[PDB]
């Protein structure tokens, strides 16, 4: 596999190049927020991001070497995690606020508009504060997002061995980045641990978000796109 022969700097460059753009929301400032309209904005945005995520995933080293069934499974498992870590990343320089889009910057009080969503917002905001406190770098972020894609669904499955080899490459890459930044050997494995432990919180936010989205759907609050309905159905809530 060509993904395994990639150097650390080559891994970084490929991942940075594959980065999806920052999309805009359908936000209409002429009308006040309702629970339905806000859920409509967020799910509309997520849907358009999903299309970009799918094409991004195909550019993640080693991903296209997998069967279509395994690609489907990994994306079905990690899609909300990936949306959330992206949101948390672009919200870093906005304390107390979530930048869903450049025209949609929301605080926790605006999250109250939707039943049960402020709890999700708080968790997202806390993660964003954590990345900000750690001074998370862009190169580190794209490594983390790719780790999520490959790892989250690998335990629900050699295809598995190929995935683990790639994950090891990304670990090497993260360490390489930290060493290049001047971190001592001890600081390197300490920071590596700190970054990966946050993925447990991201997984948690995804599970909570999946249940909340399912809740909104089953109360006919918002019509989900056919793609979103499928991604949600994959979790069988």
């Amino acid at each position: 596999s060509l993904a395994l022969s990639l150097t650390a700097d080559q891994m970084v460059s490929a991942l940075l190049d594959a980065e999806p753009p920052i999309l805009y929301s359908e936000y209409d400032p002429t009308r006040p927020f309702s629970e339905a309209s806000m859920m409509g904005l967020l799910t509309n945005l997520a849907d358009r991001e999903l299309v970009h995520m799918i094409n991004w995933a195909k550019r993640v080293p080693g991903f296209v070497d997998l069967t279509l069934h395994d690609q489907v499974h990994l994306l079905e498992c990690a899609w909300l995690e990936i949306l959330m870590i992206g949101l948390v990343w672009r919200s870093m320089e906005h304390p107390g606020k979530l930048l869903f889009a450049p025209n949609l910057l929301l605080d926790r009080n605006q999250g109250k508009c939707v039943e049960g969503m402020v709890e999700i917002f708080d968790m997202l905001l806390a993660t964003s504060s954590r990345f900000r406190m750690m001074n998370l770098q862009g190169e580190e972020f794209v490594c983390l997002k790719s780790i999520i894609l490959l790892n989250s669904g690998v335990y629900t499955f050699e295809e598995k061995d190929h995935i683990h080899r790639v994950l090891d490459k990304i670990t090497d890459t993260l360490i390489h980045l930290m060493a290049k930044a001047g971190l001592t050997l001890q600081q390197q494995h300490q920071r590596l641990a700190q970054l990966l432990l946050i993925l447990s919180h991201i997984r948690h936010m995804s599970n909570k978000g999946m249940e909340h989205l399912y809740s909104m759907k089953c109360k006919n609050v918002v019509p989900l796109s056919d793609l979103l309905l499928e991604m949600l159905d994959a979790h069988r809530l």
């Binding site: 195909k58 279509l68 994306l75 056919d226 793609l227 499928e230």
Partner: peptide, 9 residues
């Protein structure tokens, strides 16, 4: 599945 279709070319 839409996802399966989208993951192609």
């Amino acid at each position: 599945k839409i996802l399966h279709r989208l993951l192609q070319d």
